[PDB]
Enzyme design. Structure first.
Site, short mmCIF file in Angstrom:
data_model
loop_
_atom_site.label_atom_id
_atom_site.label_comp_id
_atom_site.label_asym_id
_atom_site.label_seq_id
_atom_site.Cartn_x
_atom_site.Cartn_y
_atom_site.Cartn_z
N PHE A 73 0.85 -1.20 0.00
CA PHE A 73 0.00 0.00 0.00
C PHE A 73 0.88 1.24 0.00
O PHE A 73 1.83 1.30 0.80
CB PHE A 73 -0.95 -0.02 1.20
CG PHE A 73 -2.14 0.88 1.15
CD1 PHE A 73 -3.21 0.66 0.28
CD2 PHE A 73 -2.18 2.02 1.96
CE1 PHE A 73 -4.30 1.52 0.27
CE2 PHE A 73 -3.27 2.87 1.95
CZ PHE A 73 -4.33 2.63 1.10
N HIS A 110 0.47 7.68 2.15
CA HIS A 110 -0.75 8.43 2.44
C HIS A 110 -0.73 9.01 3.86
O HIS A 110 0.09 8.62 4.69
CB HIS A 110 -1.97 7.48 2.39
CG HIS A 110 -1.94 6.38 3.41
ND1 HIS A 110 -1.09 5.30 3.31
CD2 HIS A 110 -2.63 6.19 4.57
CE1 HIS A 110 -1.25 4.51 4.36
NE2 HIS A 110 -2.19 5.03 5.15
N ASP A 112 -3.59 9.26 7.11
CA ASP A 112 -4.86 8.61 7.45
C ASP A 112 -6.10 9.51 7.44
O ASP A 112 -6.03 10.71 7.74
CB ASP A 112 -4.77 7.97 8.85
CG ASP A 112 -4.04 6.66 8.93
OD1 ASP A 112 -3.54 6.22 7.87
OD2 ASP A 112 -3.91 6.06 10.01
N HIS A 153 2.87 7.61 5.80
CA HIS A 153 3.35 6.26 6.05
C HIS A 153 2.90 5.31 4.94
O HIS A 153 2.05 5.69 4.13
CB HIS A 153 2.91 5.70 7.43
CG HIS A 153 1.42 5.73 7.63
ND1 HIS A 153 0.71 6.90 7.85
CD2 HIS A 153 0.50 4.72 7.60
CE1 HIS A 153 -0.58 6.62 7.95
NE2 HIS A 153 -0.74 5.29 7.81
C1 LIG Z 1 -2.08 -0.33 8.35
C2 LIG Z 1 -3.57 -0.66 8.60
C3 LIG Z 1 -4.18 0.66 9.20
C4 LIG Z 1 -4.14 -1.01 7.19
N1 LIG Z 1 -4.51 0.10 6.32
C5 LIG Z 1 -5.78 0.51 6.05
O1 LIG Z 1 -6.65 0.03 6.77
C6 LIG Z 1 -5.96 1.63 5.05
C7 LIG Z 1 -4.94 2.79 5.11
S1 LIG Z 1 -4.96 3.66 6.74
N2 LIG Z 1 -7.28 2.25 5.28
C8 LIG Z 1 -8.27 2.46 4.45
O2 LIG Z 1 -8.09 2.07 3.27
C9 LIG Z 1 -9.53 3.14 4.88
C10 LIG Z 1 -10.55 2.04 5.31
C11 LIG Z 1 -11.84 2.80 5.74
C12 LIG Z 1 -13.02 1.83 5.96
N3 LIG Z 1 -13.43 1.02 4.71
C13 LIG Z 1 -14.25 2.62 6.48
O3 LIG Z 1 -15.25 2.71 5.68
O4 LIG Z 1 -14.14 3.27 7.55
C14 LIG Z 1 -3.36 -2.12 6.49
O5 LIG Z 1 -2.91 -3.09 7.17
O6 LIG Z 1 -3.13 -2.04 5.25
FE LIG Z 2 -2.67 4.32 7.24
#
Ligand SMILES: CC(C)[C@@H](NC(=O)[C@H](CS)NC(=O)CCC[C@H](N)C(=O)O)C(=O)O
Ligand SMILES: [Fe+3]
EC number: 1.21.3.1
Length: 327
Positions: free
Chosen positions: A207, A210, A212, A266
């Site tokens: 990933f 970005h 958060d 991150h």
């Molecule tokens: C590192 C973790 C935070 C994780 N990343 C993630 O969860 C990534 C980037 S913070 N987050 C997202 O894409 C947003 C999810 C929001 C969710 N569908 C909602 O509707 O609220 C990973 O393991 O990839």
């Molecule tokens: Fe994140």
């Protein structure tokens, strides 16, 4: 090479010793002004039982059940499911898969569900006879991590010079937009090359970079190192700790503080290993508005316009998908 991520004993934030709370708030302030990350320890949650029940669910769910719980991006029949439900893997192309659920008080009779307000949805669950006890365990876990997150928000308020309920008064059981995501990152042999991205510096990723979309993020992960943070000395590795919760600020906190507490940039490295990543995104209510301020200025004034949390969240979730892709 390794990022400075301190371990902070957050147990005083659950009690009434005010001086002990202030010494925790200072540690939060120092971490927030340095790399932007810390580990919360002595938090009181049974994370080993959380990991065992999540693994029982991820390893027993079947393709039939995933289509039946899928969000709109994977199943055109489920037009009301934008956030809550199953996010499928794409065999040979996308490795990660996950299950997202929202506030358990968002029932069919809740006023925001009745009004069809953006970002609010009724949760979907697997069959009880096929997954005995899962829904009850997962709803109890939402309230256990909500209680931890409320204690952490008292610590962030004290650190910034505000009364302890400054953020917590906007974080309520009846209307929080917070979400739990149960993410499975699989071991695969051969691993799909389209699920591996490469950064400008050459690192292989799952990933990309970005900030958060949250007020704060409260994360449990298995013991497999994977996250990196961008500092003034370049990208640095965050160590794993499967006994604690990794905490960082999101871009709503950076807006409110005029970038005094930055939302750290991150990314997630690619690792070929079976592991879990279980974030709780601390979101406020749809109409919550905190007036922006600036802790570096004597009068605390900032030249930023107020933004409601519902407006921030709706535009933030879309921007993140457009930049880094549908999860
Ligand atoms: C590192 C973790 C935070 C994780 N990343 C993630 O969860 C990534 C980037 S913070 N987050 C997202 O894409 C947003 C999810 C929001 C969710 N569908 C909602 O509707 O609220 C990973 O393991 O990839
Ligand atoms: Fe994140």
């Amino acid at each position: 090479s390794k990022a400075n991520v301190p371990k902070i004993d957050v147990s005083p934030l659950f009690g009434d010793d005010q001086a002990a709370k202030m010494r925790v708030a200072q540690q939060i302030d120092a971490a927030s002004r340095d790399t932007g990350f810390f580990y919360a320890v002595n938090h009181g949650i049974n994370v080993q039982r959380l990991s065992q029940k999540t693994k029982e669910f991820h390893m027993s769910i079947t393709p039939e059940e995933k289509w039946d719980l899928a969000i709109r991006a994977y199943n055109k029949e489920h037009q009301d499911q934008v956030r809550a439900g199953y996010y499928l893997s794409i065999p040979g192309k996308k490795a990660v898969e996950s299950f997202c659920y929202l506030n358990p008080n968002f029932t069919p009779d809740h006023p925001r569900i009745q009004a069809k307000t953006p970002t609010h949805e009724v949760n979907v669950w697997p069959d009880e006879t096929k997954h005995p006890g899962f829904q009850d365990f997962a709803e109890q876990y939402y309230w256990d991590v909500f209680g931890l997150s409320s204690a952490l928000l008292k610590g962030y308020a004290l650190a910034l010079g505000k009364e302890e309920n400054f953020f917590a008064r906007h974080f309520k059981p009846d209307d929080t937009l917070a979400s739990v995501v149960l993410i499975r990152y699989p071991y695969l042999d051969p691993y799909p090359e389209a699920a591996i991205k490469t950064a400008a510096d050459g690192t292989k990723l799952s990933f990309e970079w970005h900030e958060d979309v949250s007020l704060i993020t409260v994360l449990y992960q298995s013991n497999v190192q994977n996250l990196q943070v961008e500092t003034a000395a370049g990208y640095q590795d965050i160590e794993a700790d499967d006994t604690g919760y990794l905490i960082n600020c999101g871009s709503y906190m950076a807006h409110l503080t005029n970038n005094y507490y930055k939302a750290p940039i991150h990314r997630v490295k690619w690792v070929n290993a079976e592991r879990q990543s279980l974030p709780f995104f601390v979101n406020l209510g749809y109409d919550s508005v905190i007036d922006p301020f600036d802790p570096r200025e004597p009068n605390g004034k900032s030249d930023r316009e107020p933004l409601s949390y519902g407006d921030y969240l709706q535009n933030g979730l879309v921007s993140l998908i457009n930049k880094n892709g549908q999860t």
